[PDB]
Ligand binder design. Structure first.
Ligand SMILES: [Cl-]
Ligand SMILES: [Cl-]
Ligand code: NA
Length: 129
């Protein structure tokens, strides 16, 4: 599923990401834009052989199982394919564990490089929330 901007904002808010660990909703929308272009089916292979999955490009080295990332963990206790669902529940629940792990949203490379420190409120401007 390719979400619209305000449609994703609403879904993330319902699932409890607005201000989760102090990260306002626009941070999460911005991260999703630059990680996946709002496409739940996005996948991207990394040099190390791990893969990033879904709307927030959650990586198989630590967070999910894809059966093809040797030595990896599955800290969210989910198949990586669950992160590709049109329902963002699994991705949100896993993102909550990631962002709680010490480094906050810096875990998301595109967030750090493209969202952090910017006017992220722009991402939710005009949305009915
Ligand atoms: Cl594996
Ligand atoms: Cl933080
Ligand atoms: Na894994």
């Amino acid at each position: 599923k390719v979400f619209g901007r305000c449609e994703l904002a609403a879904a993330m808010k319902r699932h409890g990401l607005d201000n989760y660990r102090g990260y306002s909703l626009g941070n999460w929308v911005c991260a999703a834009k630059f990680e996946s272009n709002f496409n739940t089916q996005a996948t991207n292979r990394n040099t190390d052989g791990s893969t990033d999955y879904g709307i927030l490009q959650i990586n198989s080295r630590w967070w999910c199982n894809d059966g093809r990332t040797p030595g990896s963990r599955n800290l969210c206790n989910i198949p990586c394919s669950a992160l590709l669902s049109s329902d963002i529940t699994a991705s949100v629940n896993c993102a909550k564990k990631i962002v709680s792990d010490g480094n906050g949203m810096n875990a998301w490379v595109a967030w750090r490089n493209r969202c952090k420190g910017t006017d992220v409120q722009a991402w939710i401007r005009g949305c009915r929330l």
